Amino acid sequence: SDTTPCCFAYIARPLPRAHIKEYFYTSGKCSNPAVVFVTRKNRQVCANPEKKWVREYINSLEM
Amino acid sequence: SDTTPCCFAYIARPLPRAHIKEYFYTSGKCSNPAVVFVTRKNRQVCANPEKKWVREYINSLEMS
Amino acid sequence: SDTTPCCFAYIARPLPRAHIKEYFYTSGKCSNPAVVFVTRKNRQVCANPEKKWVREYINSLEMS
Amino acid sequence: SDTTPCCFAYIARPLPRAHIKEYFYTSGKCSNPAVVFVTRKNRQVCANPEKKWVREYINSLEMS
Amino acid sequence: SDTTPCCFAYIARPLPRAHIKEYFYTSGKCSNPAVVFVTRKNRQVCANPEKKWVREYINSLEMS
Amino acid sequence: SSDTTPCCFAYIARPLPRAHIKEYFYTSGKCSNPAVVFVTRKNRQVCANPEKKWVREYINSLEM
């Protein structure tokens, strides 16, 4: 019964890697697939899970 | 935040009126139309725009 | 402020007329032409100018 | 729903660092990618992500 | 005042003629030519001096 | 500012009485010339040179 966050557009220019703290996937019932990066000071940017630079960010955050 | 709050399910019963603090309509690009009530403890509850009890909650919110 | 407000979608069902306080057209630099209604507590809603009820609202929230 | 703030140009001369309080990126729907700085007394300035001085300003605040 | 009002974009869809009451030209030192229509409740719209419907409006406004 | 953007083409010659200065803002980025605009207690907009010293400490005092 609660609201769920969705993304409807992606940023083009890659975010500074050193600024990123966390990440998570948007819900599956959302109209569009998306990854949300969270910077050290609570900035949230909708990224595209299909592009390459987005994946290697995710791999870096967990290895 | 780039993210936009959306709804996929409406609240079953009514909500205590003394608890509601603010309201707003859902996004246009959201798949389903929705009313979101905000409360004293900063939570967001989805409600059906068609049902009666949601309407006068917005209405009496709107006048005094 | 340097930023300018734009709309990328529209509300589906009409809004209670008595709640409407003001209206304005969005800037021409925006991709999608839109009307923005403002309720008595500054809740803003994106509407579609080609629709009918949107126009009739604009005609009457303007005259007298 | 709500209007989304966009930028269509950028300030040429850098802002005083001591005056800036917050930053954020504009939404992806916008035609022009932009940084938005916010001062201590709530002014908003559209900055250019590609040009250098804008980047250290973001780097300095985020890493502090 | 010392500032000078300017326009950097035009609206596409023509305004309802009955809503207009006044008009004026932007200054020549501005980058772009522009007329500004003023509605009954002080809404301002930038228009394009080269398009037909703009001149027909100005004509009807002058045959008062 | 949804419809026209205020721009400057000339700067004021002698400094402004500080006790008359209420608020400031920078001009838009598509304006041909960069400028600082002071707003006074009687709601008049005054253009000032962003390079000249007295204009800067006025802003700095305003923002501290």
Side-chain angles (χ1 to χ4, degrees):
Chain A
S1 182
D2 292 14
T3 59
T4 70
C6 295
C7 297
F8 295 88
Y10 313 114
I11 200 54
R13 198 198 185 62
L15 204 155
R17 162 69 182 94
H19 288 40
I20 310 187
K21 175 177 55 183
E22 311 179 332
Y23 84 96
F24 67 91
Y25 285 89
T26 54
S27 181
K29 35 205 172 308
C30 280
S31 179
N32 306 286
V35 163
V36 172
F37 289 111
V38 178
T39 75
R40 191 148 109 84
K41 301 217 166 306
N42 202 20
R43 300 299 160 252
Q44 316 187 346
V45 179
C46 284
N48 185 17
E50 230 159 291
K51 291 214 243 212
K52 181 164 70 75
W53 73 267
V54 170
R55 171 54 51 179
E56 33 199 56
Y57 269 12
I58 296 180
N59 289 333
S60 303
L61 286 177
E62 243 159 30
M63 252 73 69
Chain B
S1 313
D2 299 332
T3 59
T4 307
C6 293
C7 289
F8 301 91
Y10 303 124
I11 190 80
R13 188 171 180 82
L15 252 161
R17 176 63 181 91
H19 292 68
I20 304 185
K21 157 183 157 113
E22 24 179 315
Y23 91 100
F24 65 92
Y25 296 102
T26 201
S27 177
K29 232 157 188 30
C30 273
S31 181
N32 305 281
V35 178
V36 174
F37 286 120
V38 194
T39 169
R40 173 166 179 319
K41 254 78 109 246
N42 295 14
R43 298 290 182 269
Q44 307 172 357
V45 183
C46 305
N48 182 21
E50 305 187 52
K51 202 134 181 217
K52 157 66 186 166
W53 75 265
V54 180
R55 292 204 293 261
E56 85 278 359
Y57 269 7
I58 292 186
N59 198 296
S60 45
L61 257 177
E62 206 78 49
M63 300 314 174
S64 272
Chain C
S1 177
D2 271 11
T3 66
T4 66
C6 300
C7 295
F8 299 95
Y10 312 108
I11 187 181
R13 62 178 295 176
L15 200 158
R17 169 68 178 91
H19 299 174
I20 309 283
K21 175 174 82 187
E22 331 178 332
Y23 88 105
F24 67 89
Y25 302 93
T26 57
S27 180
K29 331 176 207 177
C30 293
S31 306
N32 300 287
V35 178
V36 170
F37 292 107
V38 175
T39 63
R40 206 166 135 73
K41 313 78 187 145
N42 312 273
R43 297 297 176 183
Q44 324 186 327
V45 178
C46 289
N48 189 18
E50 335 177 36
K51 295 295 272 166
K52 315 281 202 315
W53 72 268
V54 174
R55 299 199 300 266
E56 310 198 334
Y57 270 15
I58 294 180
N59 199 344
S60 173
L61 160 85
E62 167 92 87
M63 267 169 196
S64 65
Chain D
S1 152
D2 218 13
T3 62
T4 86
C6 300
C7 295
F8 295 101
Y10 315 99
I11 189 179
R13 185 175 184 264
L15 227 61
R17 172 62 175 88
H19 296 203
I20 305 180
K21 181 176 68 180
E22 184 180 1
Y23 87 101
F24 65 88
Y25 301 90
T26 60
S27 188
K29 323 127 179 169
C30 291
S31 313
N32 298 125
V35 179
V36 176
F37 290 105
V38 175
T39 119
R40 317 193 77 97
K41 268 278 153 156
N42 275 269
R43 325 262 146 228
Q44 320 203 330
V45 187
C46 288
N48 202 17
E50 29 185 6
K51 257 190 207 335
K52 181 58 184 307
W53 68 268
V54 179
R55 285 199 288 268
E56 328 200 339
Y57 271 6
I58 299 181
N59 198 330
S60 178
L61 211 179
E62 195 80 59
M63 300 292 298
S64 178
Chain E
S1 322
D2 194 328
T3 59
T4 301
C6 294
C7 300
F8 296 93
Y10 313 113
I11 197 57
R13 181 179 180 274
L15 221 46
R17 162 70 180 88
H19 294 200
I20 323 280
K21 80 175 177 181
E22 306 182 341
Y23 84 97
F24 68 94
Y25 282 81
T26 55
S27 166
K29 13 194 183 168
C30 287
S31 304
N32 309 285
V35 345
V36 174
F37 292 111
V38 184
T39 70
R40 305 278 195 228
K41 214 75 218 283
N42 204 343
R43 303 292 169 253
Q44 299 187 339
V45 179
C46 284
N48 186 13
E50 299 183 56
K51 293 251 232 143
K52 248 194 260 87
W53 72 268
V54 176
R55 94 175 93 136
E56 299 169 1
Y57 276 20
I58 295 187
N59 284 333
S60 180
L61 233 44
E62 288 280 359
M63 160 158 137
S64 150
Chain F
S1 316
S2 38
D3 35 0
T4 65
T5 325
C7 296
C8 289
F9 304 93
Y11 305 116
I12 188 174
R14 94 174 304 115
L16 232 38
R18 176 60 176 94
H20 293 186
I21 305 295
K22 178 23 199 168
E23 62 180 301
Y24 89 100
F25 64 89
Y26 303 93
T27 56
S28 181
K30 244 188 188 29
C31 280
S32 181
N33 308 275
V36 175
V37 178
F38 286 119
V39 185
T40 67
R41 231 153 70 94
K42 323 229 201 224
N43 247 263
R44 299 289 182 268
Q45 302 175 347
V46 178
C47 299
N49 184 22
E51 306 184 63
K52 249 265 187 46
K53 184 165 182 55
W54 71 267
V55 182
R56 312 198 23 230
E57 41 256 16
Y58 270 22
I59 291 185
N60 189 87
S61 173
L62 273 170
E63 228 147 66
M64 299 299 173

